[model samples]
Target: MNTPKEEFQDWPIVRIAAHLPDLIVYGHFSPERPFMDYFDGVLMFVDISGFTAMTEKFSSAMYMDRGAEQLVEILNYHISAIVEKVLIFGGDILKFAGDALLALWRVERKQLKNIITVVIKCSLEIHGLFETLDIRVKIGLAAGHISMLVFGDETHSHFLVIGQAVDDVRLAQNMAQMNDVILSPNCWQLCDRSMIEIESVPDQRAVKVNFLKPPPNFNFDEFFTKCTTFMHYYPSGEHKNLLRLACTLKPDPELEMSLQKYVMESILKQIDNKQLQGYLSELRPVTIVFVNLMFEDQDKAEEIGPAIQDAYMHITSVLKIFQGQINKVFMFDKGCSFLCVFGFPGEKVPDELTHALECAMDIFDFCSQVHKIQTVSIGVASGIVFCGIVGHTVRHEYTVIGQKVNLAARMMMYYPGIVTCDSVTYNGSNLPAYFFKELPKKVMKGVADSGPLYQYWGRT
Candidate 1:
């Protein structure tokens, strides 16, 4: 089962919220102009296949702590790309349903043929995204007359869609496979016959579509330019920084517009990467956890090098749980260390530090199970931390700047098979005090005094 956080993050309604501002500007929303009627267009459902199995695989692989985080990230990776495709091809996404995404490409009667043709082209782009992300998705597409409405209360409003075409798409996705794209009979009929290889499935309901990269006798330049222009207003994030990184095309007016599209997409991608970046450097109280693996002796380091590396990999993998950021890693011949933060970039969970302590307990137990890791140490601290992105030039990574980070590092020292923390963590934590064994309080080289350092008596 996915955590509530996981489910909420994966919920399709988030898409509705993200696009609401744009929807309002386009007059799809307005208390002054509430509207609903029949509409001609195509609907699509792109779903990830075997997502449940993928979750179980990660759990069983000793990554139970944060495997779900990795899973959501991977799914989002593909969904983001697919969403961009749908938008660039003149479509609007309705929601993200767990691992599946819902989108619609609305068009007129005269534009139907061209819209369907472009949808297939867009589907090709979506299919390719899965391949690169090392995942598989089932895609189902169909065209028909559908109903659209703007209905809801002031606090919570929605643009509702209904019709047989909606049900048809659901069925199409259910029948499709990772390697195949399923199209309804209606969709197949609307597509150019020479544009793709259409195969009849056993069921009379759907057809499998094989796309043409550049459909024969088509004007590639005109379409690419149109796509590039469409992307200018509704730019594609994946196409911007990552996609255009290698998409060297002719340096013409089309290319200049394409470059603009790329820049806008990057900004969009940045605004919504993980969470919205409405402002910078917001101070938030958080529990910071730093895990370290150390070899006391120099002689045995080389013999256990591979083991050390494996330990590092496992630790980082486990850190994904609690949705904590694995902020940084420090490695040497001696061993490796990881810096993790909780409730910094997102919510202010009151039990954030406690959760880190619990996570550390799980990790230490995990270390005990793995032969390569004889011991590990963890330091948990709670304090106000400033978090946001640093740097402007292409890559902008999140940063946490504060003095408490130093305090956590100070507390992270040699400990066998358990976690460590200060009085603040112990008091704020749900971990029982019986397990906390206090050590000599020593002031560090910094501003404050080390009041008391206690190690959690978790497990051997």
Candidate 2:
């Protein structure tokens, strides 16, 4: 007989505590808490360059047989230092996009200038730390209003930042060159130009800020001491009292394992077994499929949440059959998109290219039957990706990053209700040609020479 499915337990607060900020964790357990809020803030994105190339080199035959602990060592070391600097400046990490970090400093309207100065100082200091490392990083800073939406039911919760703040931050990061700090137009206008050395670029949308002079009125030492007062913590209660009185909460390992599915299976196992201490990371071939869900009806917005949960359940069931893992999920009001990969850090799966296409087709077909669903766009691409950990031990995570991953996201933007894939996936698949139709070569953003693409048609 098949094994019985595990039921959802109470919040495994400790499991995710390391991954998210303390404020989010406390809000989860607090009664009658207002988890969602909007605030004016400065968003900073620090993106590491040359990390991908380093991943490739370290994973070459020389280190592939024995393992690439060197790469993991460097990644964890640098990311840990960066995280420390951000925390020291009272910036909370929002998310990590592969090798890039998106951190936020929530501030009031009047404190915008001060926060911008602090963030610039933090970024430059981080750069200084990397002076001896082979890798380079670019930073982008933007200031605006941000909506921090933390929503979910009892079983699962999601933290999402939806606003122009994130948009401008991402664009600013994209415009930054290696080792350069770029500022969004809004940030430029908000800050006092006299305190910062700035230069104009051709785009006029963003300017480069090379240096910052200490603002005369801002007292760094006093502000640093006051920032500690804003630190969030779990309130005193039965849970805290019980934990303090007793040495431990006696957390259930089985329930913790249930929550562990958020990370890759192999990595979690290694971490649990203590086999992954300061040594991890690998470069491997993976077939990635991005499932994009869009909700069409504004009037039925209430139905979107349940529909999305339903879709997630269906996708998980499909992935079980295909041996695929959903690495990340991006959820918004009207829609959501998730990243799925086959032949990841674990044991190899045969014909993953074909499996990737089949997985996308099944997800597309399942979502099509949903009532509130308007379109289920899918993208599939196969290539070598850096599959390993990022961040420090306390806040680390497993992520996949590469050009093919980017291509998969770009492909999803093509025809709705269709599975679009790059030539790599199409040519390498074991499936017959009749299953796919070729499309003309198109210029795709962030992708050079994308060549001809293919659209998957359902089995006859």
Candidate 3:
């Protein structure tokens, strides 16, 4: 007789949740289980400007490890204070986009004004706090219907917020000036226009929010604290009941070690002592590969689940063979993308650029073979990028940022079902013309001197 035996031996939630956002973790435990959530809410994106300049203060030669530690110390300290205020005002901290912070506050249609009021106040107070610390930031605010979707395979997951509100917030963030808080037109209309001091920016659809005239007369802290307490109360006090159980759980050391599986091997190797030491920022010439998996419809969660699993499965296998690092895997409004890099502060083989380009081709072919995938776009570029960890201890990720990375993304979006790379990658690669075809010069916004772009025809 055949018998089924228990093969699984570990509880994985604790390990996975260790590196994920708190809202995601809470949602996993929520009674109403939905992979996607639609709600009327306020969206805020706070971009920390001049942070890279601050990092430049520490010389990479001498400050190597100490630089990352010092920067993280200041970052965690200030970010913690800002997080406290956001939580107090009933906002959920979302993903950290680079050095920026994305947060959301879900609310009913009738409660829009109240939530926006508190959110705006929260933005202003955040700016005020930064002022004392001598740091610069820009904020974008949008209020309207928002869609929060979770895209993942069974083992790994990523969250994405979409809709017009998300778009407005991103535009507002890009247009905002130093220490400026801008609001989307829809968000502005919802506010009591006469009660707030705002300047309508010339030729731009957005407005710069200055301040709230005749600020609240009552004690803001005490009032918001009481409101937070009220919000925590749910039907039959279930919220408090869950909290008690959550606070008493035993710690797991093995789970902590498991987090390394998600982090890149390049980052892990730099740390002399894993627990106490920090990763140092370095300007290194690297090759970036962006693989965008396109789908006909994004709303079909069932189809996406298996498709992502297939894509990651094949992508990771190729990455391991080529010694590439997956910097990020995320979904936007349309489809999902994988950000990869080659040649960090680790071992490098001969003609590494060729390896990176070849890796991109393999990923493209593998993902294209997946039936659920409509098509795949791969872009490769080579240049110097700032490599280090971003965000506070509350949450953080290692990433590479620079013009070349941006250029690769630009090339990625230019076409579908083909691998495109910048001139630098093409010229540096040892591969010949049988594997590449010269493409027309494309104008890439925000990137200077984009040189000639090329299309990889794949190995013949």
Candidate 4:
């Protein structure tokens, strides 16, 4: 029963990969990596405030290493908690960068507010955890298009992401103060009304609101023309669409144009409105896969080349063997990182996690057959990811965004040559008994300020 080939068919790797031409490729030089092309979501980051200072205070080599370990341990706790809670609430953690974390969430317009509430709750928990370590975290959220690809030969290629969203989150992180979580105006637009309570910054000018009466069945084209013309008088031209999309009825060109310009300047103010229904349709259960490739011995390019191919082959082959059982396999570009998604194509997916666990085991075995490397860590998280194509059409990529993606990547950092799955994936899967061995609850990095994350190891 469950022959590897039959299992592969159950997962339909080929078909799924076919739908995601942006990711899969035969050679390593392509713009898209086999793993990264499958996602349509967002990326986020969280940076710790005082890590450099703490590291400097420790003088001895042993103390420094130990101190670093302690810091990571604390960070891991917050990461784990945030990942778990985000998934439980329907989100996906994408990756972890040093002290920062990235994630994706898929929700419909009606549910966007709830998702933001969950993010706030998770952020507050992280803030509380940092207090114990005397560490502060500045959280940033941004949304945009992302593309995953590998560069160089098979032995040198690495996973990478290119998009303004990634840049936006990093910029937002810079704008955040200690314990502050900053969200971009585009990100805020997806929020539900009840989820965020806003107070204007003192020095900032008050945003003026105007009520306008419009005629029945108004033409959008005419309204847009007037709005563009009126934008000449405004300092910003951002929220024009909000006014156009939210009006109860069509208004005169003069009125429409004025409203358009005003809306652009205060686009952040519309995050809680009902007009952003597109944001809500993107939610779905997802599985995240994290890959670690070591290339310290040789030139960075040489080491990454073969390692990326191995990772791609391993992930794709496994998905092929279990196609019917899984949904989508998403890969991100972070040198040695990838995410495998499940329970996304349909309203509900089968408990087929054995496919993922076995794949991890196979990758380990395969790696051992080819190299002398000691270990490669893999983390799997399943939850909801916000999947979509965003940004100006001229420069857009499909991606998944949410906190779940962040926690999963953070969990991977704590283990080597091991596959760790979150509660969402574990509870949802019909995995064998041997796959459910005793695993200690570990705190994930980036989310330590959030809470404890229950972690389990699945061995092949």
Candidate 5:
């Protein structure tokens, strides 16, 4: 047989083969393979539902790339947690699918029940994580004669358990629906009678199984409204769509209409409002502020630290002064800087540019106390960006994207100490009088020529 390296020269293929060599050579090896005893016992499969639909809707290369990366991270966290619990019960995770995992145990028949019980408990926790993202998973289990064998070349081998029991487990997984777990008769028999329980399939006698209920659909709109009310919200592109889905399932037209109005008003206000403070929520827009902190002299920590901290406190306090004004405050990359968004939940944009300017001034004033710092620059840009949870059901981060964000960063980069504005924004705001100071046009880095660039100094 060709060596694993020679058989699969591709990097992804080789990496997978190296992780489980037996699967690569399943065709060549038999149950007599020496590594058989290491197998322990049992095989379990978990399948993530809605993955296909998610991929289809978010086909943008960037979106898909992020989605896949997040899925891998979530899977790893959940699988590792389950593996840890398995160890407590003398079981080990033998292998895993993209969305499923197979575990084994070394206990006697009587103890097999204990292993199954633990597996279900761990699976439930994983289900909870998925619930936050509105995704579901199905788990299947089978126990019987199993052996681990090696397949493929030396560098690209695969490991797998071969038996009708494994096949039965897969069949059981297929039989299970969204948010449901189904175990084969073999697994059911092994589980402890007290800890493990099974409910008969109505009208079906061929197979007996246990059905786990899906998590309750928490009223996300109400939850979001409350979050917005407390200034702990960040609106993402997915937010509206998810709400639409929620409405479809639960039918709340009033909530759905309110959300639609909030999104449109925020967009319109960004174009209409010229002053930062003027940009207030029609129904109380959640306010988010992003501050970039740059050190003038690396050795001046004594000077810069106090200034940054002071500015942050004042800004947050001021934001909180307004009822339902600020939503979700996040500090990123240590204390270098942070972001705050207002008018989240069902809020509208107020004085988009003015708010940004105010934030910049606040930071600048705070930094003025530090003599070692030559100067601190602040730029504020406000508009909608794609913001939401990005990743698989288990692990995700809230983020935003759009020209407004890019222009904001660019504006900050251009003038270190003053607020900056992009042409797109300047034009959108009827060329506000405060943006009288302008810099010569230069090609912005990372963006194409089609993306024009402009610079503005603090308003006159």
Candidate 6:
């Protein structure tokens, strides 16, 4: 036995067969196989929040002793869910820190977009799955060049992806609030805007950093924007290129061509043609309707009551009738206000303002019947207004912003009984004189020459 084992110790056939992951035997267990190489790409740090709090709460000896085994059971479950999602998303689950783990996504520049997309998908699943266990997840994303060393030479086995990206993601993870996903500047610049909710806050050095989180009521088909930057041979600019190249693994000529091709192709299969075709970020020639609702008295404004909900319901119903959408809604001291846009996202219409006005009329009619409601202010303006979506990694929102939008808000500030609009809307519609009455040519603050304002006094 000693003589046979000793003779085969350095045998390539036996060792390669043992370490080759048995593609012929195991077949589809490629990622699980033993391989070694350097990967260059994005790094994400996922930290499970609420674990320390649980530990603290179970400090009592009796409860702690009784639940110790079950405690690890749930913790293992959480970690298992996270690791499985990471692996499924085509990321290499690198080092597993005590409370957190790091994942690396390395691919060619042509497949760079998939790196962030898959990482985000993993984050979403990890966050969603862990919530049932009363645990929260925090994800910090840092994308750029990075060298990932995979080791497994007979004994020691694991992957280590490090550099500025790893450190940056860890820093982001540390600074992130529970249930929050923070994005480094590098990651922020690479994401699609209209797909998720994002914001900025001052960092340790008073520098603003962007972070993203899931949006409320998200539907990918309605929110996702398309892009084509993934196939480009280079970064968008010198700064980005330099930043991305900083952590990149040096080109290796000594490595076998067969191994290199196999590695790249194996990883690429995880993403499955993720590059988007073309790009869509802006929309135009739309109608903007401003609606502000409040109780009969300002005192009821702050109180939580059915009146406010009823008001929103009516507004939504009327909007739904005309196939419109609310771009945003906000609360003011007076009460709640909302912005409604017509002819957006894809479907267009002729004289969109007319339909917008009809919707406003219905909203006004419905609100007038409410016992707590007094009056509603509505302003409609039609012109080349923009509408789109913006989000990153895991979230997005529908956005409508343009000069005509500002004009509509200004018009909505008019007297409640009057339906206000600009000349573009007035001249574009074919309504009766009783439906349209001209006011003194309105001069706005920023404009040297203003257009005529019209009032619809026909119905109300």
Q: What is each predicted model's overall lDDT from 0 to 1?
A: 0.57, 0.70, 0.69, 0.45, 0.43, 0.52
Error of 3 at 266 (Å): 7.6
Runs in model 5 lying further than 4 Å from the true structure: 1-40, 61-91, 108-110, 202-460
**Candidates, ranked, TM-score:** 2, 3, 1, 4, 6, 5
Model with the higher TM-score, candidate 1 or 2: 2
Clashes of each: 2, 0, 0, 83, 48, 12
In candidate 1 the C-alpha lDDT for residue 90 amounts to: 60
Task: Please provide, for model 3 over 109-143, each residue's C-alpha lDDT reduced to its tens digit, 9 standing for 90 to 100.
Answer: 87776667778888998888864634678899999
lDDT of 5 at 221: 43
> Candidate 2 vs. truth: CA RMSD?
8.0
TM-score of each: 0.46, 0.77, 0.73, 0.41, 0.36, 0.39
Tell me the lDDT of model 6 at 295. Answer: 52
- Candidate 1 deviant stretches above 4 angstroms: 1-25, 28-35, 57-61, 132-134, 213-216, 224-460
Report the lDDT of model 3 for residue 308: 72
The best candidate in terms of TM-score: 2
What CA RMSD would you report for each candidate?
21.1, 8.0, 8.1, 19.8, 25.3, 25.6
lDDT of 4 by residue, 1-460 (tens): 6545321221112212211112222222333333344333444465666543443343236654354344334444654555444433333444334344555543334444444445554555556555564567777665544555443323223345544455566666666667776665555655443335543323422111111223476553464344333222111245332211111123344333322321111121222252452432244555666555443333233344445565556655665565422212322222245555544433244655656556666665566554433356767776545543322111112344445666666777776556676666676667655666546666655554423333344543
Residue 294 CA displacement from its true place in model 4, Å: 3.2
Which is better, 2 or 3, measured by TM-score? 2
lDDT of 5 by residue, 1-460 (tens): 8555322222322222222212221223342212233333555666665433343334356654354344434444554454444333333444433334555543444445544555565555555555454456776767766544332222112234545566567766666667666777777766655544467654432133453332376453453344233221122344432211111123244323322221223333332343342222111212234455565424333343444445545555555443223222211122244454544544345555455445545556665555444555544555444343222221122333334444555555555565455444455543465555566565666344424333444444
lDDT of 4 at 424: 64
At residue 227, candidate 1 shows an lDDT of 46
Residues 1-460 of candidate 2: C-alpha lDDT, one tens digit per residue: 8988643323343534345553353332322112446678888989898666676566568774534466667777888889878866767776766778888877667878767877888888888887674677888899988766543334344455656666677778778777888898999988878779988878567899877776678776676555434433322343333211112223656545334434455655564564654344666788889888987636242455556667877887788788887777765435578888888655377778888888899899899898778889998988777777778644556777777788888888755679998888888989889999987677776567667789988576
Poorly placed runs, candidate 4 (over 4 Å): 1-281, 297-299, 324-335, 346-348, 368-374, 448-460
lDDT tens digits, residues 1-460, model 1? 8555321232222222243322222333234212455667787887765543454454445754555445545544555666666765666665443355577766665566666777777787777765453457788888888765443222222344555567577778777766678887777777767767877789575898865645566795477555444332343554443222222223344323322321222233444474355443445577778777765443243334445445544555565665565554444334455667877544456667667887777766666555555457777777755444332211123444455566777677534345778788888887677878997666565436556778877633
